[PDB]
Amino acid sequence: PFCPGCLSFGTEILTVEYGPLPIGKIVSEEINCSVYSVDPEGRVYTQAIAQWHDRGEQEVLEYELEDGSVIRATSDHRFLTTDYQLLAIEEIFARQLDLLTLENIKQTEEALDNHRLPFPLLDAGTIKMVKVIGRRSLGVQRIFDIGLPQDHNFLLANGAIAAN
């Protein structure tokens, strides 16, 4: 079936235990690990993955942000905006809204202080508000997703917060 919010194989999730890892690998090997997620209150916390989804193949597009980072996902994949809405990346692009991202993130395990979590996202690190400046199709590619016990969202290695 068509997956509204899926990511490319190579999309790196910032895992707590292992650092940046492609979602394709996490799903292919059903890797048990934790991700950094945001709760309804706006706090970042660690969450263990509950399910792994290989959704087959579908069009994947590369969205480029103002800071040069890229997001390779389905057009309806939601991301956290600066005004704290979870909107489709294509919508964020069409409306020229800003994605709420962290920048200068350590690309290793325990990128954030596990001891201090939960902690407010806007105070967890250097916040970088960026718009989507372009989109280009990558054609039909493999797509993935993961399931979480509480909130279905997680921090990507590039600082963006993917929200299914």
From Swiss-Prot:
Coiled coil: none
Cell compartments where the protein resides: Cytoplasm
Post-translational modifications: This protein undergoes a protein self splicing that involves a post-translational excision of the intervening region (intein) followed by peptide ligation.
Record's miscellaneous remark: The intein is a split intein capable of protein trans-splicing. The N- and C-terminal halves of dnaE are encoded by two separate genes located 745 kb apart in the genome and on opposite DNA strands. The dnaE-N product consists of a N-extein sequence followed by a 123-aa intein sequence (Ssp dnaE1), whereas the dnaE-C product consists of a 36-aa intein sequence (Ssp dnaE2) followed by a C-extein sequence. The N- and C-extein sequences together reconstitute a complete DnaE sequence that is interrupted by the intein sequences inside the beta- and tau-binding domains.
Self-association state and partner proteins as the record states: DNA polymerase III contains a core (composed of alpha, epsilon and theta chains) that associates with a tau subunit. This core dimerizes to form the PolIII' complex. PolIII' associates with the gamma complex (composed of gamma, delta, delta', psi and chi chains) and with the beta chain to form the complete DNA polymerase III complex.
Primary role: DNA polymerase III is a complex, multichain enzyme responsible for most of the replicative synthesis in bacteria. This DNA polymerase also exhibits 3' to 5' exonuclease activity. The alpha chain is the DNA polymerase.
Similarity-based family: Belongs to the DNA polymerase type-C family. DnaE subfamily.
Protein name: DNA polymerase III subunit alpha
Species the sequence originates in: Synechocystis sp. (strain ATCC 27184 / PCC 6803 / Kazusa)
Gene: dnaE-N
